[PDB]
């Protein structure tokens, strides 16, 4: 997927409550800062949920492709809230960006 598409998608529908940069304050979501290679609920600061911990996997790309499709299917009992990134493109594009962003 395209990191440029990905960056726009992130700005439009992730960046509100997350950060990938150093310094980028913990918001409603935790700072990803080196997400890929870590497990569900590692980022120190935000209070994780049982369910996220129950899930207990390592994040790569496939995992987000699947998670971003249905947070409830991956993690049974999340916050709600958007349905999911229905567009497989938007997911891949986004993930390709995040791969960059979290490494810089």
Asked if 14 touches ligand HEC (CB under 6 A), the answer is yes
* Partner interacting with residue 28 (select from ligand [C-]#N, ligand HEC, none; CB below 5-8 Å by kind): ligand HEC
Contact (CB, 8 A) for 92 and 60 = no
* Binding letters toward ligand [C-]#N, positions 51-90, x by CB under 6 A: --------------------x-------------------
Q: Which of 53, 73, 79, 87 binds ligand HEC (CB under 6 A)?
A: 79
Residue 74's nearest CA partner among 91, 90, 89 is: 91
Query: Measuring CA to CA, how many Å separate 86 from each of 15, 30, 34?
Result: 18, 23, 25
Burial label for 34, CB within 10 Å (0-12, 13-18, 19+), is middle
Confirm whether residue 26 is marked as ligand binding: no
Site track 20-59 with ligand HEC (rule: CB under 6 A), x = hit: --------xxx-x--x----xx-x--x--x--x------x
């Amino acid at each position: 997927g395209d990191v440029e598409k990905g960056k726009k998608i992130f700005v439009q529908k992730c960046a509100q409550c997350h950060t990938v940069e150093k310094g980028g304050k913990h918001k409603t979501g935790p700072n990803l800062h080196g997400l890929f290679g870590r497990k569900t609920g590692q980022a120190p600061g935000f209070t994780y949920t049982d369910a996220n911990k129950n899930k207990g996997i390592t994040w790569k790309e496939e995992t987000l492709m699947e998670y971003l499709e249905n947070p409830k299917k991956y993690i049974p009992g999340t916050k709600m809230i958007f349905a999911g990134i229905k567009k497989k493109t938007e997911r891949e594009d986004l993930i390709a960006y995040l791969k960059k962003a979290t490494n810089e």
